[PDB]
Design a protein around this ligand. Sequence first.
Ligand code: LHG
Ligand code: LHG
Ligand code: LHG
Ligand code: LHG
Ligand code: LHG
Ligand code: LHG
Ligand code: LHG
Ligand code: LHG
Ligand code: LHG
Ligand code: LHG
Ligand code: LHG
Ligand code: LHG
Ligand code: LHG
Lengths: 63, 63, 63, 63, 63, 63, 63, 63, 63, 63, 63, 63, 63, 63, 63, 63, 63, 63, 63
Amino acid sequence: DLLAGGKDDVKATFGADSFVMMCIIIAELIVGVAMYIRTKNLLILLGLVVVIVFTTVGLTFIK
Amino acid sequence: DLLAGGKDDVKATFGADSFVMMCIIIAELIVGVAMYIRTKNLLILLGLVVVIVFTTVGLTFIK
Amino acid sequence: DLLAGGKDDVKATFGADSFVMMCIIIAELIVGVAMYIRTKNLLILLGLVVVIVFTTVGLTFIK
Amino acid sequence: DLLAGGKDDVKATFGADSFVMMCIIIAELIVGVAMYIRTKNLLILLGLVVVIVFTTVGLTFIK
Amino acid sequence: DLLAGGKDDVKATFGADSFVMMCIIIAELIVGVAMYIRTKNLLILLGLVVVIVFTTVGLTFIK
Amino acid sequence: DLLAGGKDDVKATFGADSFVMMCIIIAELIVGVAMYIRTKNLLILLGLVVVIVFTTVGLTFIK
Amino acid sequence: DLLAGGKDDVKATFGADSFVMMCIIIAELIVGVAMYIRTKNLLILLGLVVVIVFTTVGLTFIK
Amino acid sequence: DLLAGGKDDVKATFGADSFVMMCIIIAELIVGVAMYIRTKNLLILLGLVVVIVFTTVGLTFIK
Amino acid sequence: DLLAGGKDDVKATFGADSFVMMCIIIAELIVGVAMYIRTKNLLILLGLVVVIVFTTVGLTFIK
Amino acid sequence: DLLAGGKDDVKATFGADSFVMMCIIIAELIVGVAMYIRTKNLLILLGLVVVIVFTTVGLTFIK
Amino acid sequence: DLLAGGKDDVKATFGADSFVMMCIIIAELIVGVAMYIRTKNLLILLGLVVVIVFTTVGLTFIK
Amino acid sequence: DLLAGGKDDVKATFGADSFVMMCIIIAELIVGVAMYIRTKNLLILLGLVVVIVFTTVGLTFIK
Amino acid sequence: DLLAGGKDDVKATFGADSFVMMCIIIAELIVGVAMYIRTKNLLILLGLVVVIVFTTVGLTFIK
Amino acid sequence: DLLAGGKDDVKATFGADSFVMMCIIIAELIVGVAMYIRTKNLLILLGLVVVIVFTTVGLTFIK
Amino acid sequence: DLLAGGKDDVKATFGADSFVMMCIIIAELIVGVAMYIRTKNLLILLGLVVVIVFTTVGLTFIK
Amino acid sequence: DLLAGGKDDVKATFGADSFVMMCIIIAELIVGVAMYIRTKNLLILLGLVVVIVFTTVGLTFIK
Amino acid sequence: DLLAGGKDDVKATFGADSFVMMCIIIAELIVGVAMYIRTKNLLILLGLVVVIVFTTVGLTFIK
Amino acid sequence: DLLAGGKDDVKATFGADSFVMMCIIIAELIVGVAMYIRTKNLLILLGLVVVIVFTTVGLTFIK
Amino acid sequence: DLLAGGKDDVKATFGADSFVMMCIIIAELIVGVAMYIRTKNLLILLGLVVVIVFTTVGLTFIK
Ligand SMILES: CCCCCCCCCCCCCCCC(=O)OC[C@H](COP(=O)(O)OC[C@@H](O)CO)OC(=O)CCCCCCCCCCCCCCC
Ligand SMILES: CCCCCCCCCCCCCCCC(=O)OC[C@H](COP(=O)(O)OC[C@@H](O)CO)OC(=O)CCCCCCCCCCCCCCC
Ligand SMILES: CCCCCCCCCCCCCCCC(=O)OC[C@H](COP(=O)(O)OC[C@@H](O)CO)OC(=O)CCCCCCCCCCCCCCC
Ligand SMILES: CCCCCCCCCCCCCCCC(=O)OC[C@H](COP(=O)(O)OC[C@@H](O)CO)OC(=O)CCCCCCCCCCCCCCC
Ligand SMILES: CCCCCCCCCCCCCCCC(=O)OC[C@H](COP(=O)(O)OC[C@@H](O)CO)OC(=O)CCCCCCCCCCCCCCC
Ligand SMILES: CCCCCCCCCCCCCCCC(=O)OC[C@H](COP(=O)(O)OC[C@@H](O)CO)OC(=O)CCCCCCCCCCCCCCC
Ligand SMILES: CCCCCCCCCCCCCCCC(=O)OC[C@H](COP(=O)(O)OC[C@@H](O)CO)OC(=O)CCCCCCCCCCCCCCC
Ligand SMILES: CCCCCCCCCCCCCCCC(=O)OC[C@H](COP(=O)(O)OC[C@@H](O)CO)OC(=O)CCCCCCCCCCCCCCC
Ligand SMILES: CCCCCCCCCCCCCCCC(=O)OC[C@H](COP(=O)(O)OC[C@@H](O)CO)OC(=O)CCCCCCCCCCCCCCC
Ligand SMILES: CCCCCCCCCCCCCCCC(=O)OC[C@H](COP(=O)(O)OC[C@@H](O)CO)OC(=O)CCCCCCCCCCCCCCC
Ligand SMILES: CCCCCCCCCCCCCCCC(=O)OC[C@H](COP(=O)(O)OC[C@@H](O)CO)OC(=O)CCCCCCCCCCCCCCC
Ligand SMILES: CCCCCCCCCCCCCCCC(=O)OC[C@H](COP(=O)(O)OC[C@@H](O)CO)OC(=O)CCCCCCCCCCCCCCC
Ligand SMILES: CCCCCCCCCCCCCCCC(=O)OC[C@H](COP(=O)(O)OC[C@@H](O)CO)OC(=O)CCCCCCCCCCCCCCC
């Protein structure tokens, strides 16, 4: 059988609605605008979108 | 269940009416005019508009 | 609630009647005449007008 | 309140009777005659007039 | 399904009655007259018409 | 077999009716008119058409 | 004989119909249009074609 | 005489048809397209060819 | 075999009855009359005829 | 012997009846008429003919 | 004596009838027509000829 | 006397007819045509000639 | 002695009976008639003669 | 004394009867006729003569 | 006294009759004709003369 | 008193007539002509003069 | 209370009449003329003025 | 009080009659004539005058 | 006092009777005739006179 195996709730800690998933997404926003202002090209504002989908489709592979 | 999960008020710190959202928007204005004067083309004054909408529609994805 | 949230007076520093808003407008004038003399076409003298309105209608979005 | 806000005398430096306003107007004269002699059409001598009024009505917007 | 998908109101920001659609059309007018006066041929005054229709029939392709 | 293979819905995120496909097409419009006004030649207004078809026939190759 | 030799299904992970081959092709599309709009020359829209064939004829060399 | 000398099958592990020779070639493909998209010059797609021949003519020197 | 090869409907987009073929012919009319009025010689009104036949016999070479 | 040598079908992709050979010929038509209308001299309509023959006699040198 | 000296078949890989010699010649054709259409002068169509002879008389110096 | 002094055949490895002298010359050809196509000026095709003579007159200084 | 020195057949490529010498002479004819029709003076039809002799007596200086 | 000093035969490579001196003279011919046809003035056909003498009297200064 | 001071023969290596002084002068010739053909103005053929005298009167300052 | 103070002859090593002062001046000549040929403007040939005087009036400050 | 708080005379070291304020202003002059001569546009001579006022109004904020 | 404050004689080094003020003025002369000869317009000879006055009225601000 | 202050003889190097003042005047002559022949208007032959006086009255300001 499995040991240490536990709980999982660790998943709920890092999961969909979380504190860490909430700060990791807000940093993408705030330094996304930063690296935009210093440059002014737009692929970087789109760089926020790839974090939205990545975390979303990423978290479903945890199970 | 969730841990560390907290408060959120961190959202209120970086949210709609905030100090950091107030300075990140005012820098777009002041270096927007800068890179305009050194060049004098207008897509850059419009570069302020894309920060208005980006932060606005961005903050609603935090939840 | 909000943290760091402060004062604002930072707004009064960069606001309507300010030192930085006073120098950023005077540079538009002095390099506006410059790029005019080296060329002598008039859309550039009008380039001062777009800084007048931009800062004016820009500062009202800070709030 | 305001910070950095200062003095203004910076205005007196770039203002009506100044050193920089005195040289920026004298360059209009000397390269105005230049681009006239190489061509000999008169709208360019009139190009000095638009610098007279522009700086005059421009400086009053600083305040 | 779709993510990030949002709102749209971004469309209302750049749409038919807007601030940016209002300034992008007024620049066509003011530099249209400019490039007319320096030349005096009329296809350029007609250059304003092609911006009227282009934005109009353009915005309907957004959906 | 395949791993990581997933979902696809990533396709629905960047697909036909999307948020990113909606902004990438609206930028073609707004800087299309820009580079038109500064020049006034028409192949550039047609530059919007090639983005319409390119994204359309492009997205069908994703599968 | 061979060791570690395995499975292959790793091939099916990166192969013809895949998740990674699906995202690597969609990035060519979205930054292809980007570098087009900022420039407006067409060899770049054709830059999508060379990724179609390259991955296609590339994957057949894996075996 | 020779000691430790063994088997060789280690050669079959890293040889022509292998697992490691299969992944080392597939990385050339996937980061070849990457460094292409971020740049769009073609010598890099040809960078896959030099890995094909190098491993091929390289493995024959093992003996 | 062929890749990327597609659809064609791109042909229907630029083909006989189209939007772009409709605007490219109407510009010949409107600037044809222009360059006529400023001059008043008639080979230019005939310049519309050569666009009629050119697009007609041109489109049949696409296949 | 030869390596990487492949398929060719790459030839069929860029060959006689193709998608890229179909768009590269249709651009000659549409910007041929453009540079004609802005000028109205006819060697440019003949510029379409030299693309017909060039691609035709060019493709036969690929082999 | 010589080491590493090998095979040559590397020559057959890059030689007369090859895959890389087939793509390097087809790019000359497709961007030759490109830089022609954007300009319409003919020395560039002749630019394909100098690649024909250069590779031909070049490959004979390999030995 | 001399030590380590050996053989030379290392000279035969890098000498006139060699594998490395064969690949170092073929790269000059293939990236010579590359940097030609992206530009179309001819001093670069002549850049192959200076590698022919340089290696030739260079190798004779080894002794 | 000489290096790179080759073949010549490059001479036969650009020589008397050639493909490039055949197209360079036919362009003189077709744009000779063009610039004649738009003007109707005859020194230009004679402009074809000077290309006949120039290439003829020119090619003999190659050796 | 002198080092590296060599051979000269490098002189024979670029000298009187050479491959590079043969192509550098044939380009003068072929783009000489080009820039003639697009213009039809004759000093340019004479531009071939100045290359004949220049290379001739130039090569004698090498020694 | 002096150290390292040597020989000079380094002077004879780069001096009047040398290998490097022979190639540095022949490059002036071959790219002199190049930049002439692409332009056809004559100050550039005279650009060879200034290299003749410069190296001549330059080398005498070495001592 | 002074220690380590020595000899000077180090001065004679780097002084007026030296080996290092002889090579540092000859490099100015040889890369002076280089950067001239690639450009053909003359301030650079004069760049040799400023090294003549600089070393001359420089060495007298050593004492 | 305050510690380390000292003297100030550090202010007198970097203050109005100082050694460092005297060299920092003289460098603006000497490299101001430099970047002027290499270019010859005049906003740079005015670059000395902005250092005059900046240090002046800057030093008053130290207190 | 002040420290490091010194001497000034640094002023006498860069002052009115100096070595560096003597070379910085002579470069304006020699590259002034250069950029004149390559162009032949006269505002540039006047560019020497603005260095005369600038250094003169500049040095008086050092104190 | 002054440092670095030297000699002047640098003045004698660039002064009235000099090598550099001798070549800078002879270039005015030789490219003066050039730009005359290609045009045949006479203000340019007079362009030599303005170099005579400019260097003459210029050198007297060095002191
Ligand atoms: C778990 C699945 C992982 C799949 C990830 C796929 C990555 C494959 C890489 C493709 C080519 C690399 C392009 C280099 C990047 C490149 O060349 O562009 C560079 C660009 C930012 O520009 P830079 O500031 O780096 O400056 C470079 C510029 O000069 C070039 O325009 O990258 C971005 O961040 C913009 C993103 C927009 C592009 C969107 C593509 C769609 C992405 C979707 C994948 C979502 C992941 C979900 C997974 C959970
Ligand atoms: C979260 C959603 C993210 C979506 C972001 C969409 C980005 C897709 C990129 C499209 C093509 C890139 C064009 C390159 C940019 C380009 O070529 O123009 C360049 C231009 C500035 O010009 P530069 O100084 O860089 O000089 C280049 C010039 O020579 C070209 O005119 O960019 C700007 O900053 C002007 C912005 C006006 C254009 C407005 C477009 C509408 C934007 C709306 C999106 C709002 C985001 C909201 C998200 C919260
Ligand atoms: C916050 C709101 C942002 C909205 C900004 C709107 C920008 C949209 C761009 C429209 C087309 C771009 C034209 C390119 C510019 C162009 O083609 O002209 C070029 C012209 C200067 O000429 P250049 O020296 O660049 O040389 C180019 C010339 O050859 C063309 O005549 O631009 C100027 O600086 C003159 C401005 C007069 C035009 C006034 C327009 C009215 C503006 C009002 C917006 C005020 C902003 C307030 C926001 C706070
Ligand atoms: C702060 C307020 C800014 C408002 C500025 C107004 C600019 C609007 C542009 C109007 C049409 C542009 C005409 C192009 C210019 C054009 O086509 O003429 C060109 C002409 C010089 O000729 P060029 O050497 O460029 O050669 C072109 C010739 O072939 C055409 O005759 O421009 C001048 O410098 C002459 C100025 C006389 C014209 C006086 C007009 C009255 C001006 C008053 C504004 C004073 C500003 C005060 C602000 C402080
Ligand atoms: C989304 C759909 C895009 C379709 C765009 C169609 C563009 C096809 C180009 C046709 C030939 C190009 C002519 C070159 C232009 C040319 O030769 O004229 C040049 C002329 C301006 O003259 P310039 O100052 O450039 O000087 C050139 C003069 O010497 C020639 O008279 O262009 C204009 O801006 C005037 C526009 C009047 C012509 C109106 C035509 C009707 C247009 C309707 C399309 C509306 C677009 C709606 C889309 C939303
Ligand atoms: C996926 C399939 C990819 C195929 C792409 C085909 C590209 C082949 C390039 C042909 C010659 C290049 C011409 C250079 C461009 C050139 O010379 O014109 C230049 C012109 C813009 O003018 P510029 O501002 O660059 O100034 C240059 C001017 O002086 C020349 O008139 O380009 C445009 O953006 C106008 C587009 C109208 C032309 C429409 C052509 C039809 C296109 C259809 C393809 C749709 C793609 C769908 C794929 C999803
Ligand atoms: C795809 C096939 C391409 C074939 C194109 C044939 C072009 C050969 C050029 C012949 C001589 C050039 C004459 C210069 C032009 C010239 O000298 O006239 C000049 C004239 C316009 O006059 P401009 O305003 O340029 O001022 C010049 C005047 O002073 C001279 O009268 O050109 C026109 O646009 C009028 C067209 C009427 C002439 C009709 C001819 C029949 C054309 C039929 C071809 C249809 C093409 C179909 C292809 C799809
Ligand atoms: C692979 C084989 C390559 C051979 C290519 C041959 C190119 C040799 C250049 C000859 C002289 C250059 C003339 C400059 C061009 C010149 O002076 O005319 C200029 C003319 C266009 O006029 P522009 O708008 O450039 O304005 C210039 C005018 O003022 C002069 O009338 O060029 C064209 O595009 C018209 C083409 C009609 C001429 C047809 C000639 C027959 C061509 C056949 C070759 C087919 C290639 C097949 C290869 C696959
Ligand atoms: C291995 C042997 C290497 C020998 C290479 C010889 C190169 C010597 C350079 C001569 C003068 C340079 C002219 C600059 C180029 C120049 O001024 O023309 C420029 C022209 C293209 O025009 P662009 O678009 O650069 O615009 C410039 C125009 O405004 C000038 O018309 O160059 C071409 O690509 C056309 C080629 C036709 C000319 C054919 C010449 C015959 C070539 C034969 C050599 C074959 C090589 C075989 C080797 C394997
Ligand atoms: C062992 C002996 C070493 C001696 C080497 C001699 C190098 C001296 C440098 C002379 C001036 C530098 C010119 C810069 C280069 C320059 O300005 O041209 C630049 C040109 C390539 O053009 P780029 O693409 O760099 O673009 C620059 C262009 O805009 C200028 O046309 O250089 C080449 O690769 C073409 C070579 C043709 C020139 C042939 C010269 C004859 C060479 C013979 C030496 C053979 C070596 C044998 C040794 C084994
Ligand atoms: C390799 C040897 C090079 C030698 C080339 C000799 C060129 C010397 C220039 C003489 C005076 C220039 C006259 C300007 C030209 C001039 O004033 O006429 C202009 C005339 C064309 O008229 P346009 O359209 O330029 O309009 C100008 C008219 O208004 C004047 O009637 O030129 C031609 O193309 C006609 C040619 C007939 C003249 C035939 C002369 C015999 C030529 C024989 C040389 C054959 C070369 C063989 C070499 C391989
Ligand atoms: C090594 C020795 C170097 C000495 C080179 C001498 C160059 C001195 C420049 C004199 C005045 C410049 C004239 C500008 C050129 C100018 O104004 O004419 C321009 C003319 C070509 O006309 P474009 O197409 O540039 O258009 C300009 C026209 O509108 C003017 O008619 O130049 C040529 O290529 C024709 C050459 C015939 C002239 C032959 C002259 C005899 C040359 C003999 C030297 C042989 C060199 C041998 C050295 C190895
Ligand atoms: C060691 C001694 C150094 C003294 C060097 C003297 C350089 C002083 C610069 C004078 C004014 C600069 C003119 C810019 C150059 C300029 O405006 O012309 C430009 C011209 C080449 O024309 P570009 O292709 O750069 O195009 C520009 C054209 O549009 C202008 O006609 O320069 C040359 O290479 C031609 C050389 C003929 C001129 C001969 C002059 C006599 C030179 C004698 C010096 C020999 C040096 C021996 C030293 C060992």
